[PDB]
Design a binder for this molecule. Structure first.
Ligand SMILES: *[C@@H]1O[C@H](CO)[C@@H](O[C@@H]2O[C@H](CO)[C@@H](O[C@@H]3O[C@H](CO)[C@@H](O)[C@H](O)[C@@H]3O)[C@H](O)[C@H]2NC(C)=O)[C@H](O)[C@H]1NC(C)=O
Ligand SMILES: *[C@@H]1O[C@H](CO)[C@@H](O[C@@H]2O[C@H](CO)[C@@H](O)[C@H](O)[C@H]2NC(C)=O)[C@H](O)[C@H]1NC(C)=O
Lengths: 174, 214, 213, 212, 58
């Protein structure tokens, strides 16, 4: 939904048996070197922990695994609720030129981050863009950005305008 | 203003989302007078989940209603140690720092109705002279006041004093009674201290005997 | 269990710098934040994420986090900086607040300036004389004034009134009146006001003859 | 409760219901720590009364037999009439008063009048430091508050206004002191601006060094 | 009863004294009383200043 306003439709389907405490980590976030980030970050060359990914196309997803709101980028942030194959149960029960969104990410019940989007092409910000990785070191900032990307805490906040014309706040590092 | 009876329950209310995006985490912090701050728990309006501190695991309860856009915490079985000023805070979603501390809320109690204790006060070791010795019974750690002190069968009124009860440090009371007796009478005569507490319905008697000299 | 320790109190003088430390075990790998609380008021955030200060707080405040000690630095401390300071951190999914740190600023001692004013000419026409002795700016509240007319200590006929220290200052200001009556002010040529106080090496006396003004 | 000036009070004493009394009622007033005074008399059997010389004009003793009560009415109260009023009853013709009743406390609050302004002369001895302290005195006024401003409120750098102090009489006193450079003592006009709203008093007063 | 003060004379080009107060504690007495302190009063000081050190802080 536009305007960044979701009322009740987010699916509250999250697990608790596991001791990882992903939900318990919402209140506070650790430092860059305090969470073993570089060990995982070294999986991709400098020049879904980093931009090096091959997200697949996702049409529909069962709500039994969704944990938290599903944020998507027009690139301007947008939230999509559960839907009948409008049900108000809290989950208990395409490129912008062609419509919809290229891709986005969500947080599952098991407690891991998974992403899906458009297919890679073959350099641009409106043709091959699939996820929030607008640039190699720039992300589309949204309120729940830290939760899905705890390793980007050190990134700075920058205001950018993209061309329709979109005004949004992005996070980039030095 | 009033005293929250021990074993009762109290609630503290904080503004909360009416059922939409929150963009904040609500937490509660209490402060005993000048003793620093302590944490109790947090509650994200967006997510039904909550968090409880280890110390207060068995006395707190956090629930909120979206109809009134108001969230509150329920604390049960209040005790003397729980008297304090209660604060409410609202910080950013994931910055791990709380901002915009609300007004202070004061909650007070009056301890629990406890019975007294009697401790003998021995007289002087020898004091073998005309210097009449003194003996008494001390009453400590009782609440609420008062108590009545009566000597043997309540039939002694010559040189008997009962000082006003003082307020102990930890919200309790202390009181002492003492009499002056001729020295020579300690050899044979016996003295007994009788105390009564009405709210506790406790009557306690003791024998205040001279202590052994070896 | 985890515990953060802070010094019980600290003392400094105006214009100096005070260092407050919130040390702990491997505390340099966590984001700390400091809270300032004036007596009787709710805590107000002063620092979040070590050094990134909020908007509104003066630039004097500055802090850092490294090693096992995190420090908050104040420069040009003034009389408005007196307040308790609290440290914060997250550990094992459990908030921990450090022990209260009391920061006090010791204000300098200033000697009083004293004047004596005779009684107006008009009042004598109404049968009443009132000699007033004044003590100007002076911090240490302990002060004593003693009216002695013709070198004879007096008592029972004087009243005292004082103000409160100025906001951007710390000095009081005192004044004392000696209500007399005509046929008593008409004698005792020599009138005097004696004041004792710190700062002054010795008591200072300001006098004025009844005649010749 | 404070009785306003110019009002009246009524002190009540038990009186015979219309039969033989065998006792003469009286009144007595005692200013705080000042002894006892006589007010008036009354003889239930004979309706007549008897008033003292001092309070001849302000007193009036009347009694009602239906209620078996008698009282005296005192009008035009003044600050001097703040005291404790008693009520005694002695034998018929012996003249010694016995069975003194419980005391009654009656209070009044002075009156309202404006302040009087007198100037405090500046320094007479030449102070080369450059600080001469002026100030006007405001006293003998009631009730609170009064406001003092200098040079029509244009001078507020250094002005001190000590809080009012309760004099012994019952009125109030207040002062105000301004410090100015010595060299500017014979070239500027210093004026106090004392205003007392309840009495609608607005008075100025120049302050200058005394001639020598 | 267990402290001694010794003082010097003001320097030639100065008028300031200097004082040392020695407190002698018998062994097995200093082994207790975690906290020690020294409180001084004098003109110029707005309020008494006390300097205190814990027994085994370092
Ligand atoms: C002369 O005689 C007597 C003087 O006391 C007056 O009559 C008195 O009036 C009172 C008041 O009404 C009466 O006593 C009353 O009795 C009834 C009982 O229910 C009630 O009204 C009250 O409880 C009160 O006690 C009674 O008649 C009498 N008082 C006595 C006898 O003590 C009379 O008015 C006087 N004047 C004349 C012209 O008679
Ligand atoms: C989610 O459910 C709640 C409760 O039914 C809806 O929230 C409010 O419901 C009351 C009446 O039940 C309405 O008066 C309010 O207007 C609702 N809130 C808002 C913001 O409209 C809410 O509508 C449901 N979610 C959605 C997307 O409709």
């Amino acid at each position: 939904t536009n305007g960044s306003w979701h009322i009740n439709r987010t699916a509250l389907n999250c697990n608790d048996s596991l001791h990882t405490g992903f939900l318990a980590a919402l209140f506070y976030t650790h430092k860059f070197n305090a969470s073993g980030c570089p060990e995982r970050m070294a999986h991709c060359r400098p020049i879904p922990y980093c931009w090096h990914y091959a997200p697949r196309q996702c049409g529909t997803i069962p709500a039994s695994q969704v944990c938290g709101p599903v944020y998507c980028f027009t690139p301007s942030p947008v939230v999509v609720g559960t839907t009948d194959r409008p049900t108000y149960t809290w989950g208990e029960n395409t490129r912008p030129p062609q419509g919809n969104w290229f891709g986005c990410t969500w947080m599952n019940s098991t407690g891991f981050t998974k992403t899906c989007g458009g297919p890679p092409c073959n350099a641009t910000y409106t043709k091959c863009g699939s996820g929030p990785w607008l640039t190699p070191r720039c992300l589309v900032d949204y309120p729940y950005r830290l939760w899905h990307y705890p390793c980007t805490v050190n990134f700075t906040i920058f205001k950018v305008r993209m061309y329709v014309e979109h005004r949004l706040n992005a996070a980039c590092n030095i | 203003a009033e005293v929250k009876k021990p074993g009762s329950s109290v609630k503290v209310s904080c503004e909360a989302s009416g059922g939409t995006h929150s963009n904040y985490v609500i937490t509660w912090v209490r402060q005993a007078p000048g003793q620093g701050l302590e944490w109790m728990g947090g509650f994200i309006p967006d997510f039904r989940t909550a968090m409880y501190a280890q110390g207060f695991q068995g006395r707190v309860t956090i629930t909120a209603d979206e109809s009134t856009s108001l969230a509150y915490m329920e604390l049960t079985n209040l005790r003397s140690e729980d008297t304090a000023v209660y604060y409410c805070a609202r910080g950013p979603l994931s910055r791990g720092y709380y901002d915009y501390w609300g007004p202070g809320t004061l909650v007070t109690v009056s301890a629990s109705t406890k019975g007294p204790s009697v401790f003998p006060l021995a007289p002087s070791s020898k004091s073998t002279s005309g210097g009449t010795a003194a003996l008494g019974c001390l009453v400590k750690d009782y609440f609420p006041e008062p108590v009545t002190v009566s000597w043997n069968s309540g039939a002694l009124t010559s040189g008997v004093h009962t000082f006003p009860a003082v307020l102990q440090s930890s919200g309790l009371y202390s009181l002492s009674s003492v009499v002056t007796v001729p020295s020579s009478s300690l050899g044979t005569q016996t003295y007994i201290c009788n105390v009564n507490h009405k709210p506790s319905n406790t009557k306690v008697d003791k024998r205040v005997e001279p202590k052994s000299c070896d | 269990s985890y515990v953060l320790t802070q010094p019980p109190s600290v003392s400094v003088a105006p214009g100096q710098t005070a260092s407050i430390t919130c040390s702990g075990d491997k505390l340099g790998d966590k984001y700390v934040s400091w809270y300032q609380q004036r007596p009787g008021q709710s805590p107000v955030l002063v620092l979040y994420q070590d050094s990134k200060r909020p908007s509104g707080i003066p630039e004097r405040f500055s802090g850092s986090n490294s090693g096992n000690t995190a420090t908050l630095t104040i420069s040009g401390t003034q009389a408005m900086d007196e307040a308790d300071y609290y440290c914060q951190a997250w550990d094992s999914s459990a908030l921990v607040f450090g022990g209260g740190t009391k920061l006090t600023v010791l204000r300098t001692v200033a000697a009083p300036s004293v004047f004596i004013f005779p009684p107006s000419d008009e009042q004598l026409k109404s049968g009443t004389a009132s000699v007033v002795c004044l003590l100007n700016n002076f911090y240490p509240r302990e002060a004593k004034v003693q009216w002695k007319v013709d070198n004879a200590l007096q008592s029972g006929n004087s009243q005292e009134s004082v103000t409160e220290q100025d906001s951007k200052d710390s000095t009081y200001s005192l004044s004392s009146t000696l209500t007399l009556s005509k046929a008593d002010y008409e004698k005792h040529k020599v009138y005097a006001c004696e004041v004792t106080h710190q700062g002054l090496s010795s008591p200072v006396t300001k006098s004025f003859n009844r005649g010749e003004c």
